[PDB]
Structure formats: structure tokens, C-alpha cells
């Protein structure tokens, strides 16, 4: 996260850690058993950490637990990161609890303009690398389909939506790939690419959850 700040100890607490090995990824927690990332996150051998704040330092409310199944969208495509959406199955249900809890998924769509907080565990350097040990947090609003496109011409699909500002320095950025961007309580973007982090022109583009709904609740309930 560039020009974010420290969202303090589980005050994010659907915010994951996918780590294999080492942090990788974010996630969001959508149940006791599931998480939403970003399907340009998938990789085998994954542990989902939960109730993480520094994520190099054991503090007293994590949860490790390893991932039994992922599945990848049927239609992501890794060229063009459409439908740029994963869940991940975790071998025994998370205990549930202040700083280890699920978020809900949208009901609708969000509207351009309405205000987002995203979060990680990514660099939050613009030029430059700089990775923190906590949570960093930023509140950023949606912003129209138009300008979206016009900053990334041929590439926004009706599945992604872009969020940040123009202007720049305020942004997702490296490692912060697969957490969540939520909306009035509700999981609307999951962290996708961008044109690196926090440039002029260049907002982050986020997989547009909403579309994914009855994808995500038919998985789940079979699975
Ligand atoms: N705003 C760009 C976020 C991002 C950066 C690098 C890889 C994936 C996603
Ligand atoms: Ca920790």
C-alpha cells in the first residue's frame, strides 16, 4: 500500500495472509472455511494466516491453517487477468472471533465515488521497495468506468473496476495482489494489477466482485 496508513492490530480482521513460506498474497475471509484472492495468486502449497498484524512477529491471534482445495474461475484468463478471482478451501474451519472474522459479500454492484478502504502487506514505496511488517490500510474511492478505461485503453473488462486517483501516490501495490477492497461492508474488489504503484494516470484495477456472486455462493455450497 502506498500512502496508506497503519490500520493497527486487527482492525481489518477479514484481511488473510496466504503464505507459502513467506507472505505472498492477501485474501478476504468469507466464512469460516473460505477465502476470496486473486487468481493470479494461485499457487499450490498455500497456508492461510488469519488474524495477522505483523506478519514476522507471533502476537497472539493467529490462526495457520493450510489450504485443502483451491479453485481458480473457469474463465480467468492469466494474459489478460479477466476474471482475475479465486477461492481457497481451508482444511478445517477458522475459529471465529474480534479479530479473525468473515466479510460479506455484495448484494449490487458499488457506484463510482463511493468510498473503499483496501488493505496489505505490500511495498509501499511508488519508486523504490519498501515492505512492511504490518497491516497498512487506504481509503480510496471507485472511480468512473470512463476514466478507468481511459487510463488503461483496450484492457478494463466489465469485470474489473478502477480505484484510487489520478492523481497519484495513493495506491495498491506489490504483495498487496488478492486482498480486499470493501465497500460499505461489503467485499467489492479483490487487488488485480495495475501500471505500477501510485502513478499519475495510473489507479489500481481490482476484480470486480459483485459480478461474481452466484459463482462464488453455487462453489462454495457444492464444495
Ligand atoms: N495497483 C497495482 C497492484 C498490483 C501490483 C503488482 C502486482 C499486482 C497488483
Ligand atoms: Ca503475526
Not at 456472486?213 to 462454495?220: A, H, L
Request: overall charge positive.
Amino acid at each position: 500500500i502506498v500512502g496508506g496508513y497503519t490500520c493497527g492490530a486487527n482492525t481489518v480482521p477479514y484481511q488473510v495472509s496466504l503464505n507459502s513460506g513467506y507472505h505472498f498474497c492477501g485474501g478476504s475471509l468469507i466464512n469460516s472455511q473460505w477465502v476470496v484472492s486473486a487468481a493470479h495468486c494461485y499457487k499450490s502449497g498455500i497456508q492461510v494466516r488469519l488474524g495477522e498484524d505483523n506478519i514476522n512477529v507471533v502476537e497472539g491471534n493467529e490462526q495457520f491453517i493450510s489450504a485443502s482445495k483451491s479453485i481458480v474461475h473457469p474463465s480467468y484468463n492469466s494474459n489478460t487477468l479477466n476474471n482475475d478471482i479465486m477461492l481457497i478451501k481451508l482444511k478445517s474451519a477458522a475459529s471465529l472471533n474480534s479479530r479473525v472474522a468473515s466479510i460479506s459479500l455484495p448484494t449490487s454492484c458499488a457506484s463510482a465515488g463511493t468510498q473503499c478502504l483496501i488493505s496489505g502487506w505490500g511495498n509501499t514505496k511508488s519508486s523504490g521497495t519498501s515492505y512492511p511488517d504490518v497491516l497498512k490500510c487506504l481509503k480510496a474511492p471507485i472511480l468512473s468506468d470512463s476514466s478507468c478505461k481511459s487510463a488503461y485503453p483496450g484492457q478494463i473488462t466489465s469485470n474489473m473496476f478502477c480505484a484510487g486517483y489520478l492523481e497519484g501516490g495513493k495506491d495498491s501495490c506489490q504483495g498487496d495482489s488478492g486482498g480486499p477492497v470493501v465497500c460499505s461492508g461489503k467485499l467489492q474488489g479483490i487487488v488485480s494489477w495495475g501500471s505500477g504503484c501510485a502513478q499519475k494516470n495510473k489507479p489500481g484495477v481490482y476484480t470486480k466482485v459483485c459480478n461474481y456472486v452466484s459463482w462464488i455462493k453455487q462453489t462454495i455450497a457444492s464444495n
